[PDB]
Structures are given as C-alpha cells and as structure tokens.
Design a protein around this ligand. Structure first.
Ligand SMILES: CC(=O)N[C@@H]1[C@@H](O)[C@H](O)[C@@H](CO)O[C@H]1O
Ligand SMILES: CC(=O)N[C@@H]1[C@@H](O)[C@H](O)[C@@H](CO)O[C@H]1O
Ligand SMILES: CC(=O)N[C@@H]1[C@@H](O)[C@H](O)[C@@H](CO)O[C@H]1O
Ligand SMILES: CC(=O)N[C@@H]1[C@@H](O)[C@H](O)[C@@H](CO)O[C@H]1O
Ligand SMILES: *[C@@H]1O[C@H](CO)[C@@H](O)[C@H](O)[C@H]1NC(C)=O
Ligand SMILES: *[C@@H]1O[C@H](CO)[C@@H](O)[C@H](O)[C@H]1NC(C)=O
Ligand SMILES: *[C@@H]1O[C@H](CO)[C@@H](O)[C@H](O)[C@H]1NC(C)=O
Lengths: 50, 408, 177, 150
C-alpha cells in the first residue's frame, strides 16, 4: 500500500510469487534467439540477468 | 528382620508460592471513541456497561491487597534484628538484613528480586516523556493513551521485607508474647517433637550446625546461577502484560464496518451513515473489554486459592512444628523461614532425613518365664550378644528392664 | 520518520494515524492524543462533608496538568495530592491511598505514612528462660458464608415480553435459553 | 436490579420500546430492530450467568472450609496452629446465621511470665541426666524440673 509503517509485523493477502516455486528460463545468445508468446495467467514476475 | 537407621542428615528445601497479581483500571470512554465527541454521545445513546466492568476490577484490586495483608501481617509486634547473627554455632546471616549494605533487604532476597524481570520499575509515566520518546514504540505509552492503567500496591516491598525480618528474628529468639529461649535449647525440643531423644542433639551439635550452615550455602550457590525455580512468579507477570497488549492490538480489527479508523468514517460520511459503522465498532470493543474482565476474574480466583494456602503454611510451618506428612517439607519437619519475593513468598524448610540403615532380628514380645513383657513403644532387636530395646529411628541400644516394658 | 515520495500518511499497529506529511512544506509531523493520565478522588462521605481530595498519578508537583489547585499541593509516592494536609504522625490507615500512604478525616482530610505495628525488642540469653505462671480463657468468633440465593430466569419473559411476533423471531434465532 | 435496568438501553436500534416499533413499522423493517434488541438482551443474560458461576465457586470454597472446621474443631481438639482459634484450642461451639455459620472458639492463653536460669543437663557426678521432656530451672534454693507452660 502507500501507508508508512516501522518496527512492526503486518499480514496481508494478495497476489504474490510463492517461495521456492518454479520459474522458466529463456536464454538469448547468438546461436539461439528465444521470443515465444507466454501466457499472463493472473500476473507475472519477470527478471532479467544481462 | 527389621532395619533401623544409625545416622541422620539436615536438608534445606525451597518452595515458591504466588500471593498477588497486578491491579488495573480501564477508561472505557478512552478505549472506545477516543477523544471524538460524536462517538461519546453514541456511547451514551447505547448503554452503561462501564459501571459493571469497573466494579469488578476494583473488587479484584482490593482482593489483591487483602491477600498480601493476610500472608504477611500475621505478626502483631515488630521485633528488632538482634545484631549478633550467631546462635549456638548456627549462622543466620544471609537471612537477615546487613547494616553495611544500604538496602533493607537480605542477600537471598536481593538474588530473588534480581532473577525476576519486571516490566515497570515505577508507576509514573509523564506525558512529556511519552512525547519525547515517540521514536521508540513503548508499550506502556500505547496502553496509557488508550485508557488502560496499572495501579501501585499499597504495601511497599521494604515493608514486606521488614515483616519477614521480624518473623525470622522471632524464630531465632522466642521460637514461634515472647518465650525467650536459647537457640540450641529449642532445637532440642524440635527433636523431641520428631521423636528423637535430646541427647542426640546435644552430643552432635557441632556436626548439625556445620550441615545446616552448609545447606544454606548450597541454596545460595543454586540461586546465584540461573534456573527456572521462580518460573511461576514470571508466568503471572507475562500473563498480565500479554492481556493488556492484546487489548491494545484488538483495536485494529474491523467488526463488519468499512474501516477500523473512526476519523476516516467521520471525515467522509454524513451523520446517519456514520452511525451504523460506529455502532458496529462500539459493540465489538465493548465485547473485547468484557472478555478481558472475565479472564481477569478467573485468574484472580486462582491467585486467591494460592494466597490462602501460603497463609496456612506460614501459620503451620513458620510459627509451629507440623506433624502433617509433606506439608512443610519432604522429611520430618523441624523449622521453616520465610523470604519475600516479587509478587510472592519463598519458604525454606529444614528437615531431618534418616540414613545408614542396618538390619537386626526383631521380636514382638519376650516369654521370659512364660509371661508377656511388651516393649512400651519400642522395638526389641538382637545385636548378637543380647536383646535390646530401641526407637524406630536413630538406633541407640538400652538394657531391657521392667520400667522399659509393661507386663500383660 | 523518513517518508518515501509515494507515501502521505503513517499508521501504527492499532491503525491510529500517527504521522502526516505537510502538503505545502513536505515536513513530517507526529500526531499525539491530548488526554492522558490517571485521576482518583478521595472523599469521607457526602453526609459528613462536601470536600474532596484529588490524586494525580502521572504528575510530579515538585503542576500544569491539573484541573485546579485548592490548597496544600504536595508530592507523595503514589502521585501529586491536592486537598489534603500532611501529618508526620503514623496512624492505622483508614483510607488506603497507596505506596504506603493512607488518608483520614480529622476537620480536614489528612494524609500519613502507614504504621506497621508495635515495636519491641527481645533479649537473647544463653543462660535464661521465661515460663508463664498464670493462664486465661478467651472466647473468639469466626463468621463464614455457606450458601447464596437460588434464582431462575424466564428468557421469553425477559426478552420479547408478551409480544407473539418477537417470540417467533426468538424461535427463528436460536435456543441459548 | 442491574438486569432490570439494562432493558432501557438501545443496542443500535431506533428505540428500546418494542410496542412503539411494532406500532409504527411494518414487519420487514421491524425485524431488523427487534433482532438487534434480541442480540443485546441475550448478551446481558449470558454475562449475568457467568458472574453467578464465579461467585458460586467462591461460595463453594468457603462452605468446604466451614465443613472442615466443624469436623476438626467442633467434634475434636485440633493441634494445628491458628486453625480453630489463636491460642491453644480446647473446644468450639457452632451457631447458625443467615446464609452462614458462626464459630465460637475457646482457647488457653498463658500469662505472667517469669525468668529463671536454665540448664540443659546435670553433671551430678560426671554423668548426664537429661530432663525427659522438661526444663531444668534454678529457683534460688535448688534446681527443679518444670513444663514449658504453667
Ligand atoms: C554412627 C555414624 O554413622 N557416624 C557418622 C559419623 O562418623 C560421620 O562423621 C557423620 C557425618 O556424615 O555421620 C554419622
Ligand atoms: C539395609 C541393608 O543392609 N541392606 C540389605 C540388603 O542389601 C539385602 O538384600 C536385604 C535382604 O537380606 O537385607 C538388607
Ligand atoms: C499464681 C497466680 O498468678 N495467681 C493468680 C491469681 O491470684 C488470680 O486470682 C488469678 C485471676 O486472674 O490469676 C492467677
Ligand atoms: C518477663 C520479664 O520478667 N521481663 C524481663 C524484661 O523486662 C527484661 O528486659 C529482660 C532482660 O533481662 O528479662 C525479662
Ligand atoms: C557467619 O558467617 C559469616 C559469613 O559467611 C562468617 O564470616 C562468620 O565467621 C560466620 N560466623 C561467625 C560469626 O564467625
Ligand atoms: C504554498 O505557498 C507557500 C507561500 O507562497 C510556499 O512557501 C509553498 O512552497 C507553497 N507550496 C509549495 C509546496 O510549493
Ligand atoms: C520530581 O521532580 C524533581 C525535580 O526534577 C525530582 O528531583 C524528583 O525526583 C521527582 N520525583 C519523582 C519521584 O519523579
């Protein structure tokens, strides 16, 4: 949220990425170029290491 | 065959018992409706369940003061410390106050107070102090701003220490309105009460004194190190703090209303629409207060049961010798000493423990010349040379005579 | 407190708004309640007198946060006391103020330190002992409760009176009776 | 009387008087307010019952102790200290009282104590003659053997 909080523990229900869940990897190099259409499925987490 | 002991030991054991709990009060208009005037009027045009709750809480507080009075105020006349600390080879230092140390409490009492951690050293918190320390999330400030208060006990800790010192001084001299008897002489009387003969005490006095001082030193060495011995008088403390902080936290909860924050509702809703939500919140918060009060009453009953048993122990064990089994210590009871502790009392019981049992052939009666000469409260044992008459405890053989036995 | 740009208000655990960013100057401010502190009232009874004494637990009067200062403001262990005269003498604690302090009505309200009991000294002598030579017969009384009043409740009477519609609503509710 | 007085309170309803609501409101609209009142009044009854149970437990603890006193003090002599009176206990008498019992305890109280020189044992001729449950006191003329009391 946009509320400020300090030194406390706060519980919330929301769409999150569960801990120790599977993530798919796509690697782009000269040999292989990957750009498939990926489903959205109620939101996504996207990480780029480059 | 029958086995009889030939030796004895002096053991000192401790018993910890709670006496009172923290006294509290609630400002219901503070906890419910804050400083808002409209919510106060709605509280008014609802009902007066605040008078009942506070009547119950005030009763509990008065009961706590009464519990302490009944445990510690048995002694009528106060009895000054003798200044000698030594009676017949027995060291009563570490149980009586030391003039050199400024504090009026004893050494063992100092250890006991150090062990138990207490939430509040003092019962005053100033408004400016709460304002200045906003950065720290002080729990007491949060309790106070929401209408919850803790009240000080009537009897200060130094007063309880003075009562305990008077009781110990009375035990040392005059025994259990004063008898005035030498320590060693009275100790001879306790032995008779047990069943052992006086000459046993007088002959082996130095050994008994060494053992007693020695047990005191072990108690001290056991208390110096950290243990869960005083856990009960800690559980009691944590329960009270936990209940108050739980009441503080419960204000975050909605009770079917759109928001838990009254100012938001009053800011963005008109009177009639705000009335519904404020009534829901009022219902929920009153319910929380009632639950807290009920739990406090149940805890108070338990503490009352504990205080009465402690008072009975003080009357029976400290001011007398008890023949009840295991009431004032595991072994045969001789004497007991009280020490004050935070929200409770610690009893030191001194007991006689037999040891080194030896087996003899036993007879119930002696035919002698076809007659029956019964022991008259003793056992007939065969040592190997001739028959002797002895006590149940501490084997001491005596020649059989007509006076020792009764004919039938 | 340090506020991130997308934040405007701050809340505590109880959800009470405790911080606010000023719109014009962007300065963080802390909001605290105005009411705070405990109060107690000591009276000897309306029939005896109309005067009372007031004790403030959270004020040290050697001041500002007191309703009025009638006379004799003096600081005690229990807190700042207004309306009572202090007496050095010890008494038997008619009214318990707290922290070893009690109050009584002597004609004014007076506050004093609590008296534990009579003071005596017993000598210790190895060669001496005291024995009584006389005795007395005393009769004492002890009062102990045994039972309380037995009661019953007609819940349909207390709730819904003689109304038939409210009784049906009670039915289409639940049987906690 | 507190239960009686609590009927005046509204519990979020427009009125505490049921007849007014039924007089000026139709069934569906009256249902809401009547349900609110029902909830509140049931809650009051439950609170009363809980408090009665706690008081009953206290009274039970008191009655058991009284029965123990009757068995121990009235029908016997008790050697427990301060159980049946402050002094040494001789006898006790019960009297009935409204919702309770009053015990009269008769006790022996020593008085007029006098100081003597005391001995634990007598060398006599180099032997030990111990008192056999009494105190050796010196009256001024010769040594005597006495009880703790009288
Ligand atoms: C008769 C007998 O058993 N005597 C022993 C004694 O030698 C020992 O010093 C004492 C201390 O434990 O215990 C006892
Ligand atoms: C107290 C003692 O001396 N112990 C012996 C024990 O070891 C033995 O088993 C028993 C049976 O004879 O007699 C006894
Ligand atoms: C030996 C002794 O002290 N005797 C007195 C006796 O003279 C007095 O009449 C009685 C009544 O109090 O108390 C006792
Ligand atoms: C019971 C009695 O006779 N009282 C005296 C007491 O006054 C005196 O101070 C004390 C010390 O000698 O001996 C005893
Ligand atoms: C009593 O204990 C103290 C401290 O342990 C010791 O100094 C003293 O010697 C003991 N007895 C006496 C009075 O000698
Ligand atoms: C609002 O007006 C005041 C006075 O002109 C000014 O100091 C302030 O900066 C203005 N607000 C902002 C955030 O610019
Ligand atoms: C009251 O204030 C004075 C002066 O600051 C201080 O010395 C005194 O200790 C205070 N009393 C208490 C108990 O806080």
């Amino acid at each position: 949220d946009e509320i400020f909080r300090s030194d406390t523990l706060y519980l919330t229900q929301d769409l999150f990425l569960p801990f120790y869940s599977n993530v798919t990897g796509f690697h782009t190099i000269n040999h292989t170029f990957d750009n498939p259409v990926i489903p959205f499925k109620d939101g996504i987490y996207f990480a780029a290491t480059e | 065959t029958i086995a009889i002991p030939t030796n004895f030991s002096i053991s000192i054991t401790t018993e910890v018992m709670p006496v009172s709990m923290a006294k509290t009060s609630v400002d219901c208009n503070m906890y419910i409706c804050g400083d808002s005037t409209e919510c106060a009027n709605l509280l008014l045009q609802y009902g007066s369940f605040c008078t009942q709750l506070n009547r119950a809480l005030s009763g509990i507080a008065a009961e706590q003061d009464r519990n302490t009075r009944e445990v510690f105020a048995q002694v009528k006349q106060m009895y000054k410390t003798p200044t000698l600390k030594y009676f017949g080879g027995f060291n009563f230092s570490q149980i009586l106050p030391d003039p050199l140390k400024p504090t009026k409490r004893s050494f063992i009492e100092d250890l006991l107070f150090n062990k138990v951690t207490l939430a509040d050293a003092g019962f005053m918190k100033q408004y400016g102090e709460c304002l200045g320390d906003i950065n720290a999330r002080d729990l007491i400030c949060a309790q106070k701003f929401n209408g919850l208060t803790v009240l000080p006990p009537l009897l200060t800790d130094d007063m309880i220490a003075a009562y305990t010192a008077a009781l110990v001084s009375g035990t040392a001299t005059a025994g259990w309105a004063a008898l005035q008897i030498p320590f060693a002489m009275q100790m001879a009387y306790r032995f008779n009460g047990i069943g052992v003969t006086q000459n046993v005490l007088y002959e082996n006095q130095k050994q008994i004194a060494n053992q007693f001082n020695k047990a005191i030193s072990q108690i001290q060495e056991s208390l110096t190190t950290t243990s869960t011995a005083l856990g009960k008088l800690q559980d009691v403390v944590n329960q009270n703090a936990q209940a108050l902080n739980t009441l503080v936290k419960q204000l975050s909860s909605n009770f079917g209303a759109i928001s838990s924050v009254l100012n938001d509702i009053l800011s963005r809703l008109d009177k009639v629409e705000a009335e519904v939500q404020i009534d829901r919140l009022i219902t929920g918060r009153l319910q929380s207060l009632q639950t807290y009060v009920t739990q406090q009453l149940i805890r108070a009953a338990e503490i009352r049961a504990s205080a009465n048993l402690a008072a009975t122990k003080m009357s029976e064990c400290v001011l007398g010798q008890s023949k009840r089994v295991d009431f004032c210590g595991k072994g045969y009871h001789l004497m007991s000493f009280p020490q004050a502790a935070p929200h409770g009392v610690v009893f030191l019981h001194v007991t006689y423990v037999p040891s080194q049992e030896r087996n003899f052939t036993t007879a119930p009666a002696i035919c002698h010349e076809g007659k029956a000469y019964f022991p008259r409260e003793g056992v007939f044992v065969f040592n190997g040379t001739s028959w002797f008459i002895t006590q149940r405890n501490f084997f001491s053989p005596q020649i059989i005579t007509t006076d020792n036995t009764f004919v039938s | 407190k340090r506020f991130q740009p997308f934040q405007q208000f701050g809340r505590d655990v109880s959800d009470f708004t405790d911080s606010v960013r000023d719109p014009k100057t962007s300065e963080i401010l802390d909001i605290s309640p105005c009411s705070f502190g405990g109060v107690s009232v000591i009276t000897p009874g309306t029939n005896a007198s109309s005067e009372v004494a007031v004790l403030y637990q959270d004020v040290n009067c050697t001041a500002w946060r007191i309703y009025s200062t009638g006379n004799n403001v003096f600081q005690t262990q229990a807190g700042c006391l207004i309306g009572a005269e202090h007496v050095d003498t010890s008494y038997e604690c008619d009214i318990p103020i707290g922290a070893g302090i009690c109050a009584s009505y002597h004609k004014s309200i007076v506050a004093y330190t609590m008296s534990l009991g009579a003071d005596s000294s017993i000598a210790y002598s190895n060669n001496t002992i005291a024995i009584p030579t006389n005795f007395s017969i005393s009769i004492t009384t002890e009062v102990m409760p045994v039972s309380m009043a037995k009661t019953s409740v007609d819940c349909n009477m207390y709730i819904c009176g003689d109304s038939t519609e409210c009784a049906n609503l009670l039915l289409q509710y639940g049987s906690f009776c």
